[PDB]
């Protein structure tokens, strides 16, 4: 999958992926974007903890929490409560979108 | 693919798809959401033209244009110029998100 | 997913899918290949039962069984015990391959 | 895509991919299987050339050729002319299957 929907959570070792791109939430708490084996981006918080989990919040903030729930990193885009999506785009860019503007409402 | 990014266009017969869900821009100009062979949603503009094309605009408006460029249908969510995405979600709901809030900027 | 590996089973309502193609094992026991809403192929065994399940066997036979385990349909390609795969190809052709010839053995 | 069909070719930098798994035909001619950034398997032919291309042949042989068309590596599973598939399985195992046993013939 390449979309982390608001209200979801990438646990340790979990990741979004598309093509050769992998946005992985590592064990050492380093959220890294790899292009195959090459590191492309990273929160550079590796080692600050263990077993962290990336969380896309409804307020719009993309936060990396440690097991103790202390936030290690965050996009700081928190504020408007609503629906949001974190997408690992086809052009190798992880982007946050929101709030939702329209929907067919065909939701299950 | 299950994401129509703003600035993109589904031509006739083109579609977003995910699982058994297919959000197709048909020849008869009817934008329909199918769950396998069952119709789920539709703009109900079938027959109003031929060779239409769905366009996700930068202003946020999701418009169905005919070859003559006259809009046959639209979400009317036009307004704020920016980046938007139309996603055929995993829960069978086509939703529009925007503007973009954050990005790793790792864009190619 | 677009691959049913030998030893696996599509239950009722389950399906392989790729693009707009959906190879679905229906409730009425009719294994049908749809191209969006258009039926393309089918075992034409609909109604012969309820709650059937498609099974890709290790002997190479692709069988549609009813809950009572009586085979309703089968490719009759049974014979050589081994590894096989049923693939819903990108050209809209469901094909069976086997046995396996080579592998990196990198298996988890 | 995670299937290289017989008669197809991964050029330099091209790759099969699934999940965090990427079976890439590198510039240095090293066909490597990575699990994110960790190398898992490799033909160990890196440096033997430049701009190689992986080819899944109809005879069943999986060969890595150099631009000069000299084979640098091969699975040596050549022999029976027919249809074959190289699949980067969900269990992180690259496997070759063939020949084809059955098909709905729905081919486009
Ligand atoms: C400096 O290493 C940290 O940041 C790198 C990117 O800047 C990551 O690649 C790295 O993770 C990978 O390597 C470490 C070992 O150095 C390993 O523990 C991890 O599982 C990855 O393989 C680390 O986060
Ligand atoms: C300052 O709080 C915002 O930013 C923090 C990280 O910089 C987040 O931890 C914080 O999230 C928490 O509070 C919000 C609002 O109460 C809640 O919705 C979320 O689940 C966390 O508990 C917020 O984003
Ligand atoms: C009433 O038919 C229109 O709207 C339906 C949904 O309400 C669509 O399913 C339908 O499209 C499909 O059927 C038509 C023929 O009726 C066919 O031209 C089209 O390619 C689809 O198969 C149509 O849009
Ligand atoms: C003749 O109907 C059977 O075979 C068709 C293909 O030849 C299928 O499309 C059909 O399944 C679909 O329609 C039936 C109702 O006729 C419905 O029960 C099923 O869920 C599908 O929508 C059926 O198998
Ligand atoms: C020993 O290096 C070769 O084999 C490795 C696996 O055994 C590959 O990872 C490696 O490729 C990667 O690194 C090289 C530089 O050492 C780089 O040229 C290539 O693009 C990959 O990043 C190489 O094939
Ligand atoms: C010994 O030939 C087989 O193995 C070689 C590598 O070990 C392959 O290069 C070779 O392939 C070539 O010949 C076959 C048969 O003529 C042809 O189909 C293929 O396209 C290559 O030209 C064969 O696999
Ligand atoms: C109630 O939530 C659902 O519907 C909204 C819009 O109606 C979507 O944005 C969201 O992702 C879900 O599909
Ligand atoms: C009123 O203009 C807006 O809406 C129409 C359709 O309603 C689009 O054609 C146009 O580009 C704008 O999005
Ligand atoms: C310049 O556009 C790119 O970057 C923005 C955010 O920087 C994304 O929203 C967009 O989809 C592209 O990837
Ligand atoms: C004759 O036996 C074979 O074929 C039938 C269906 O024809 C399967 O049920 C069985 O497991 C074997 O594959
Ligand atoms: C033991 O089974 C595994 O390995 C064989 C080849 O070794 C594959 O064909 C099969 O799908 C599994 O990945
Ligand atoms: C003629 O080739 C097509 O059909 C055969 C079986 O008929 C498949 O194996 C192959 O991949 C193609 O789809």
mmCIF file of N, CA and C in Angstrom, chain C residues 38-97:
data_model
loop_
_atom_site.group_PDB
_atom_site.id
_atom_site.type_symbol
_atom_site.label_atom_id
_atom_site.label_comp_id
_atom_site.label_asym_id
_atom_site.label_seq_id
_atom_site.Cartn_x
_atom_site.Cartn_y
_atom_site.Cartn_z
ATOM 1 N N UNK C 38 -18.419 -6.159 -17.883
ATOM 2 C CA UNK C 38 -18.675 -7.114 -18.955
ATOM 3 C C UNK C 38 -18.146 -8.504 -18.636
ATOM 4 N N UNK C 39 -19.003 -9.525 -18.742
ATOM 5 C CA UNK C 39 -18.546 -10.887 -18.464
ATOM 6 C C UNK C 39 -17.695 -11.271 -19.670
ATOM 7 N N UNK C 40 -16.573 -11.936 -19.426
ATOM 8 C CA UNK C 40 -15.667 -12.334 -20.497
ATOM 9 C C UNK C 40 -15.587 -13.847 -20.618
ATOM 10 N N UNK C 41 -15.497 -14.521 -19.478
ATOM 11 C CA UNK C 41 -15.390 -15.973 -19.439
ATOM 12 C C UNK C 41 -16.132 -16.449 -18.197
ATOM 13 N N UNK C 42 -16.478 -17.726 -18.162
ATOM 14 C CA UNK C 42 -17.205 -18.273 -17.032
ATOM 15 C C UNK C 42 -17.254 -19.773 -17.165
ATOM 16 N N UNK C 43 -17.281 -20.465 -16.036
ATOM 17 C CA UNK C 43 -17.348 -21.916 -16.061
ATOM 18 C C UNK C 43 -18.790 -22.338 -16.344
ATOM 19 N N UNK C 44 -19.697 -21.366 -16.280
ATOM 20 C CA UNK C 44 -21.109 -21.602 -16.537
ATOM 21 C C UNK C 44 -21.686 -22.660 -15.621
ATOM 22 N N UNK C 45 -21.282 -22.599 -14.360
ATOM 23 C CA UNK C 45 -21.747 -23.540 -13.359
ATOM 24 C C UNK C 45 -22.581 -22.804 -12.316
ATOM 25 N N UNK C 46 -22.982 -21.582 -12.655
ATOM 26 C CA UNK C 46 -23.789 -20.788 -11.750
ATOM 27 C C UNK C 46 -25.097 -21.478 -11.428
ATOM 28 N N UNK C 47 -25.463 -21.459 -10.153
ATOM 29 C CA UNK C 47 -26.699 -22.079 -9.723
ATOM 30 C C UNK C 47 -26.533 -23.525 -9.318
ATOM 31 N N UNK C 48 -25.471 -24.177 -9.778
ATOM 32 C CA UNK C 48 -25.256 -25.580 -9.434
ATOM 33 C C UNK C 48 -25.022 -25.796 -7.948
ATOM 34 N N UNK C 49 -24.770 -24.711 -7.225
ATOM 35 C CA UNK C 49 -24.535 -24.778 -5.788
ATOM 36 C C UNK C 49 -24.529 -23.379 -5.177
ATOM 37 N N UNK C 50 -23.972 -23.295 -3.978
ATOM 38 C CA UNK C 50 -23.861 -22.047 -3.260
ATOM 39 C C UNK C 50 -22.608 -22.182 -2.425
ATOM 40 N N UNK C 51 -21.920 -21.066 -2.213
ATOM 41 C CA UNK C 51 -20.704 -21.046 -1.411
ATOM 42 C C UNK C 51 -19.631 -22.023 -1.892
ATOM 43 N N UNK C 52 -19.289 -21.925 -3.170
ATOM 44 C CA UNK C 52 -18.247 -22.769 -3.730
ATOM 45 C C UNK C 52 -16.935 -22.068 -3.440
ATOM 46 N N UNK C 53 -15.833 -22.735 -3.751
ATOM 47 C CA UNK C 53 -14.522 -22.151 -3.546
ATOM 48 C C UNK C 53 -13.576 -22.702 -4.592
ATOM 49 N N UNK C 54 -12.825 -21.805 -5.228
ATOM 50 C CA UNK C 54 -11.856 -22.174 -6.257
ATOM 51 C C UNK C 54 -10.586 -22.624 -5.571
ATOM 52 N N UNK C 55 -10.053 -23.746 -6.016
ATOM 53 C CA UNK C 55 -8.852 -24.282 -5.421
ATOM 54 C C UNK C 55 -7.798 -24.627 -6.477
ATOM 55 N N UNK C 56 -6.593 -24.096 -6.303
ATOM 56 C CA UNK C 56 -5.491 -24.382 -7.210
ATOM 57 C C UNK C 56 -4.740 -25.492 -6.494
ATOM 58 N N UNK C 57 -4.827 -26.703 -7.027
ATOM 59 C CA UNK C 57 -4.187 -27.856 -6.407
ATOM 60 C C UNK C 57 -2.726 -28.075 -6.790
ATOM 61 N N UNK C 58 -2.008 -28.805 -5.933
ATOM 62 C CA UNK C 58 -0.595 -29.111 -6.140
ATOM 63 C C UNK C 58 -0.373 -30.082 -7.272
ATOM 64 N N UNK C 59 -1.403 -30.842 -7.612
ATOM 65 C CA UNK C 59 -1.287 -31.787 -8.706
ATOM 66 C C UNK C 59 -1.441 -31.045 -10.035
ATOM 67 N N UNK C 60 -1.793 -29.766 -9.960
ATOM 68 C CA UNK C 60 -1.944 -28.968 -11.164
ATOM 69 C C UNK C 60 -3.376 -28.739 -11.633
ATOM 70 N N UNK C 61 -4.325 -29.396 -10.980
ATOM 71 C CA UNK C 61 -5.726 -29.263 -11.346
ATOM 72 C C UNK C 61 -6.358 -28.026 -10.711
ATOM 73 N N UNK C 62 -7.016 -27.213 -11.525
ATOM 74 C CA UNK C 62 -7.691 -26.028 -11.019
ATOM 75 C C UNK C 62 -9.153 -26.440 -10.842
ATOM 76 N N UNK C 63 -9.555 -26.705 -9.603
ATOM 77 C CA UNK C 63 -10.908 -27.165 -9.321
ATOM 78 C C UNK C 63 -11.815 -26.223 -8.540
ATOM 79 N N UNK C 64 -13.092 -26.213 -8.919
ATOM 80 C CA UNK C 64 -14.123 -25.427 -8.245
ATOM 81 C C UNK C 64 -14.928 -26.456 -7.450
ATOM 82 N N UNK C 65 -14.834 -26.403 -6.127
ATOM 83 C CA UNK C 65 -15.545 -27.344 -5.264
ATOM 84 C C UNK C 65 -16.742 -26.704 -4.597
ATOM 85 N N UNK C 66 -17.736 -27.515 -4.256
ATOM 86 C CA UNK C 66 -18.893 -26.994 -3.541
ATOM 87 C C UNK C 66 -18.604 -27.249 -2.054
ATOM 88 N N UNK C 67 -19.411 -26.685 -1.135
ATOM 89 C CA UNK C 67 -19.164 -26.903 0.296
ATOM 90 C C UNK C 67 -19.137 -28.371 0.678
ATOM 91 N N UNK C 68 -19.833 -29.189 -0.105
ATOM 92 C CA UNK C 68 -19.890 -30.627 0.131
ATOM 93 C C UNK C 68 -18.654 -31.313 -0.462
ATOM 94 N N UNK C 69 -17.749 -30.502 -1.002
ATOM 95 C CA UNK C 69 -16.504 -30.963 -1.613
ATOM 96 C C UNK C 69 -16.629 -31.742 -2.913
ATOM 97 N N UNK C 70 -17.806 -31.697 -3.520
ATOM 98 C CA UNK C 70 -17.989 -32.363 -4.790
ATOM 99 C C UNK C 70 -17.488 -31.338 -5.789
ATOM 100 N N UNK C 71 -16.633 -31.762 -6.728
ATOM 101 C CA UNK C 71 -16.108 -30.837 -7.733
ATOM 102 C C UNK C 71 -17.188 -30.489 -8.757
ATOM 103 N N UNK C 72 -17.420 -29.200 -8.942
ATOM 104 C CA UNK C 72 -18.417 -28.716 -9.887
ATOM 105 C C UNK C 72 -17.772 -28.469 -11.247
ATOM 106 N N UNK C 73 -16.514 -28.048 -11.226
ATOM 107 C CA UNK C 73 -15.775 -27.744 -12.444
ATOM 108 C C UNK C 73 -14.302 -27.936 -12.137
ATOM 109 N N UNK C 74 -13.505 -28.146 -13.177
ATOM 110 C CA UNK C 74 -12.068 -28.337 -13.020
ATOM 111 C C UNK C 74 -11.405 -28.199 -14.381
ATOM 112 N N UNK C 75 -10.150 -27.756 -14.394
ATOM 113 C CA UNK C 75 -9.415 -27.597 -15.647
ATOM 114 C C UNK C 75 -8.943 -28.952 -16.163
ATOM 115 N N UNK C 76 -8.972 -29.944 -15.276
ATOM 116 C CA UNK C 76 -8.568 -31.310 -15.598
ATOM 117 C C UNK C 76 -7.089 -31.421 -15.906
ATOM 118 N N UNK C 77 -6.330 -30.424 -15.470
ATOM 119 C CA UNK C 77 -4.893 -30.411 -15.683
ATOM 120 C C UNK C 77 -4.177 -31.068 -14.497
ATOM 121 N N UNK C 78 -4.856 -32.006 -13.842
ATOM 122 C CA UNK C 78 -4.266 -32.690 -12.706
ATOM 123 C C UNK C 78 -3.303 -33.773 -13.150
ATOM 124 N N UNK C 79 -2.286 -34.048 -12.343
ATOM 125 C CA UNK C 79 -1.337 -35.081 -12.710
ATOM 126 C C UNK C 79 0.000 -35.023 -11.998
ATOM 127 N N UNK C 80 0.861 -34.094 -12.411
ATOM 128 C CA UNK C 80 2.187 -33.964 -11.808
ATOM 129 C C UNK C 80 2.153 -33.181 -10.501
ATOM 130 N N UNK C 81 2.496 -33.848 -9.409
ATOM 131 C CA UNK C 81 2.510 -33.187 -8.120
ATOM 132 C C UNK C 81 3.665 -32.197 -8.122
ATOM 133 N N UNK C 82 3.407 -30.970 -7.679
ATOM 134 C CA UNK C 82 4.455 -29.965 -7.640
ATOM 135 C C UNK C 82 3.935 -28.579 -7.324
ATOM 136 N N UNK C 83 4.709 -27.562 -7.690
ATOM 137 C CA UNK C 83 4.323 -26.178 -7.459
ATOM 138 C C UNK C 83 3.715 -25.602 -8.724
ATOM 139 N N UNK C 84 2.588 -24.907 -8.582
ATOM 140 C CA UNK C 84 1.886 -24.299 -9.711
ATOM 141 C C UNK C 84 1.372 -22.919 -9.340
ATOM 142 N N UNK C 85 1.030 -22.131 -10.353
ATOM 143 C CA UNK C 85 0.501 -20.793 -10.147
ATOM 144 C C UNK C 85 -0.586 -20.488 -11.159
ATOM 145 N N UNK C 86 -1.646 -19.838 -10.701
ATOM 146 C CA UNK C 86 -2.724 -19.430 -11.578
ATOM 147 C C UNK C 86 -2.563 -17.916 -11.608
ATOM 148 N N UNK C 87 -2.305 -17.375 -12.787
ATOM 149 C CA UNK C 87 -2.062 -15.953 -12.911
ATOM 150 C C UNK C 87 -3.072 -15.237 -13.778
ATOM 151 N N UNK C 88 -3.620 -14.137 -13.278
ATOM 152 C CA UNK C 88 -4.554 -13.338 -14.076
ATOM 153 C C UNK C 88 -3.666 -12.330 -14.812
ATOM 154 N N UNK C 89 -3.105 -12.757 -15.931
ATOM 155 C CA UNK C 89 -2.183 -11.917 -16.676
ATOM 156 C C UNK C 89 -2.629 -10.509 -17.075
ATOM 157 N N UNK C 90 -1.651 -9.679 -17.410
ATOM 158 C CA UNK C 90 -1.911 -8.311 -17.798
ATOM 159 C C UNK C 90 -2.613 -8.187 -19.137
ATOM 160 N N UNK C 91 -2.666 -9.273 -19.895
ATOM 161 C CA UNK C 91 -3.332 -9.243 -21.194
ATOM 162 C C UNK C 91 -4.736 -9.836 -21.107
ATOM 163 N N UNK C 92 -5.241 -9.936 -19.886
ATOM 164 C CA UNK C 92 -6.568 -10.466 -19.631
ATOM 165 C C UNK C 92 -6.690 -11.942 -19.995
ATOM 166 N N UNK C 93 -5.730 -12.745 -19.552
ATOM 167 C CA UNK C 93 -5.759 -14.174 -19.812
ATOM 168 C C UNK C 93 -5.398 -14.882 -18.520
ATOM 169 N N UNK C 94 -6.279 -15.746 -18.033
ATOM 170 C CA UNK C 94 -5.986 -16.490 -16.814
ATOM 171 C C UNK C 94 -5.229 -17.733 -17.292
ATOM 172 N N UNK C 95 -4.002 -17.915 -16.810
ATOM 173 C CA UNK C 95 -3.172 -19.045 -17.222
ATOM 174 C C UNK C 95 -2.561 -19.828 -16.046
ATOM 175 N N UNK C 96 -2.346 -21.127 -16.245
ATOM 176 C CA UNK C 96 -1.738 -21.978 -15.229
ATOM 177 C C UNK C 96 -0.317 -22.302 -15.682
ATOM 178 N N UNK C 97 0.645 -22.240 -14.761
ATOM 179 C CA UNK C 97 2.036 -22.532 -15.069
ATOM 180 C C UNK C 97 2.582 -23.527 -14.062
#
